[PDB]
Amino acid sequence: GFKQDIATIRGDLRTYAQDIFLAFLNKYPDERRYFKNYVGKSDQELKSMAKFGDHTEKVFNLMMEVADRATDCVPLASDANTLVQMKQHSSLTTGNFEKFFVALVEYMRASGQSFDSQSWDRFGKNLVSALSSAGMK
Ligand code: HEM
Ligand SMILES: Oc1ccc(Br)cc1
Fold this sequence. Notes:
By secondary structure, this protein is mainly α. 68% of the residues lie in helices and 0% in strands. Helix 2 (13-27) packs across helix 4 and helix 5 (77-85) crosses helix 7.
């Protein structure tokens, strides 16, 4: 289930974080514009950049902590507010997050592992709800 999936992802955080982030950019290539240092670089070049691995991992660490603090896939409003108030997210809208979760769930369904994809979809939907309540446009 969802709790085991958090354990699976955490066990190999950096690899899942890179693979899912690249799945997101590959599905929605226009989103790369938010990451000006990743524009024009192959996946192997990205992997050679310290900040690529560091910041994928940090994104997914925070995502796992928000997931683990949720009850039945309903995140804390305080966690949604963290995400809204981060200066790094100041020009995003909930659609950016929706696309991220669509890509994440698609990756899970294509992986051939027994992720609880329906729960990640629902968690994403509930997180998007919470981001808009916390003021994201
Ligand atoms: C629930 C999903 C997300 C979580 C948990 C999250 C978390 C984070 C965290 C922890 C950082 C800081 C990383 C660091 O400084 O090392 C970060 C930075 C950033 N995030 Fe998010 N983020 C999420 C979704 C998104 C989405 C959808 C976008 C844009 C499409 C985005 C764009 C950015 C950008 C541009 C930065 C700063 C650039 C960078 O660190 O490379 N984030 N995010
Ligand atoms: O550097 C970053 C990698 C992945 C997301 Br999503 C945000 C920032």
